[model samples]
Target: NATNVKAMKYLIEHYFDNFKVDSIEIIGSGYDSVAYLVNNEYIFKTKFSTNKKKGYAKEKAIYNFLNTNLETNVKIPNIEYSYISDELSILGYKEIKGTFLTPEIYSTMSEEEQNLLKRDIASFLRQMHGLDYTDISECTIDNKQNVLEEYILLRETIYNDLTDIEKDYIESFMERLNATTVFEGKKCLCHNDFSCNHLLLDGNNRLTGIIDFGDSGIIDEYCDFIYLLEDSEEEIGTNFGEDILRMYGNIDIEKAKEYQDIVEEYYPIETIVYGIKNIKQEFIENGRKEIYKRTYKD
Candidate 1:
């Protein structure tokens, strides 16, 4: 975590003398950045290091574009203040209400409440993906690899130290996705990191906000459902993958399952990459363990 209250105070004072800071609390830390909740009114985030500052710029650009172009009801971060320099950069926004959605919390909700939440989230995804993205050209390449051959290149990292079973499962999973013409589609706007962790729920179990557009961009529509499927099974015991597709007015269960399987196998690979890139020793161990469990039965 590279958050320095003293440093933040200085930056705020330097940028805006009118705004006064009462208190700052450490909110969260991910691989890329550490965030601080400032006076419960705003969120201020800085890169984990000066080298990682590039992500902040992309995040700011995405949010700015979404705020203007997206007509959805879901609340996205409104970037109130941003400062970028060669030495350091910071992004700030007013805090959005609600708690992080979790499996335990989902278990406590009534069936009706669960359905409402799912419907709302599904609607949001539909509206987001439905947008004509040609106008909003500023975005990161969320999925650069469009084919099975391109995806095969991932093995060098993810397949390393893999148990025999793990490799075989992933290989088969990839082959299935490749065979399905369903995976072939136009790239659309995708919330690359859409998951329960970024989804916010109020007391009524309704979605109040969606946060963190740091990794969002143009990609296969299936990319967003990858994590949602895993999360729904664990949290709400519902098939969000299928439900999302149904609500979006496009139901292809076979393709959905194939994509879901591919994503499930790809997750540990993504985590391993995060661990290695961020040098997070903890994630490295967790990633290895996850691969083992997924590959080998107890």
Candidate 2:
């Protein structure tokens, strides 16, 4: 989809008068926010008041928190320009240049290169998760409650439509989630949506940076490990995250795996809820299909 450069440029020039924007393009977007690359040098993420969450304000605050707490080579967002208002909010930061990490790229690297890459990841997570998080303690959000809430949405909108196998799958997962001590394991600031898509790598295949802290919060320490433990072509696999847990140390590895397992079980159900809430038929069908596939495949 095309972005309104004229309107976006108007806002930037209106607020940060001295800044010159010669070129602009939409780099990425999600249900809540849109990120633009301006002059290929700065990223400007904007959110509207209609959006339920005040994502930009919170994200900007966490960036400051990370800058003060973290000491690493990995680049994080550095907000240089900001505009907070009742109707809209904007945060502009210098672009962290790098390639997105993926399983395919990880597979292409030599053994030593892979080891170094994993070390960089482990070091980054360990340092970030270890941050005192006291200053931004108010940023705490309960992901357990979030997941439970989404499950409620599923029960309301998609439950009657789901096949019986799908129903049982969700019920089984809920039982596990109710009993799991993973949520009670430890608490820290996590890149809540921590996954390959946010991980950026240098030309040398080293971790150059991470992006999209829109969901970063003080939550379960196991929160970030879910994607790392995913066994899929899209993810680096279960072993990769397990290795990092050992390298990162301190927390219980079994609990981390259990956390990952429960989240994986809940994904398809989350998908259907998102589909129904957003009125997307494709997502609904995809979720239902995944449910059947898993029942037989496993």
List TM-scores for all candidates, in order: 0.81, 0.89
lDDT of 2 at 12: 89
What TM-score does candidate 1 reach?
Answer: 0.81
Runs of candidate 2 exceeding 4 Å displacement: 1-3, 48-51, 85-87, 156-163, 279-281
Name the 10 consecutive residues with the lowest summed lDDT in model 2.
47-56
Which pairs of residues clash in candidate 1, taking residues 3 or more apart in a chain or in different chains?
A: none
CA error at residue 220 for candidate 1, angstroms: 0.8
C-alpha lDDT values of all predictions: 0.73, 0.86
Best by TM-score: 2
* Candidate 2 residue-wise lDDT, 1-298, digit = tens: 4446678888888889898889888888877578889998999988776444566778889998898889999999998999987688899999999999988898899999888988999999999999998888898888679878988888777688767788898888888878877888789999988899999999999999999888899999998888998888888999989888889989898888888888788778778877777688888899888888888885
